[PDB]
């Protein structure tokens, strides 16, 4: 899940980041606070995924 998205264009990279932030990051957080989340390992996994996308954007845009 690192080189799969390396070759995509910047437009899709921004799109996938938005849905990563939108869903599975905000929704998971609300679920965990309310106590309805039992698989807490998704939170860390989603956070790392967001970091991966941002790393690609910087090495794509500008430099």
């Amino acid at each position: 899940m690192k080189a799969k998205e390396l070759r995509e264009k910047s437009v899709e990279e921004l799109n996938t980041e938005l849905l990563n932030l939108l869903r599975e990051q905000f929704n998971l957080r609300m679920q965990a606070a309310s106590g309805q989340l039992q698989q807490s390992h998704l939170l860390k996994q989603v956070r790392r995924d967001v970091a991966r996308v941002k790393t690609l954007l910087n090495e794509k845009a500008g430099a």
Binding site: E17, L21, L22, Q25, F26, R29, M30, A32, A33
Partner: protein, 93 residues
């Protein structure tokens, strides 16, 4: 433009308590946790978009973390900000 992602990070979690429950059933207002800065405008926009509800006004306050005496050591909790959001006649959550 990072307004969309900003709105996705200001909200942290809902607040559950007796005061929260009575406020919801009586004043039709939701109390929830927000980021440390979380200006009133950002909270208002975030609730309108993420929760797809109409809001009237937002009141915010900062809660100071308590000092706890854990084991042989003294510690302090982190300050957090809670906001009261007053929904209009139409409420969803």
């Amino acid at each position: 433009m990072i307004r969309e992602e900003r709105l996705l990070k200001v909200l942290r979690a809902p607040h559950v308590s007796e005061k929260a429950s009575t406020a919801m059933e009586k004043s039709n207002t939701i109390v929830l946790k927000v980021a440390k800065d979380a200006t009133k405008a950002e909270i208002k926009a975030a609730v309108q978009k993420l929760f797809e509800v109409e809001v009237e006004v937002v009141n915010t306050l900062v809660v100071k973390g308590k000092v706890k005496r854990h084991g042989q050591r003294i510690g302090r909790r982190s300050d957090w900000k809670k906001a009261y959001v007053t929904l209009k006649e139409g409420q969803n959550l």
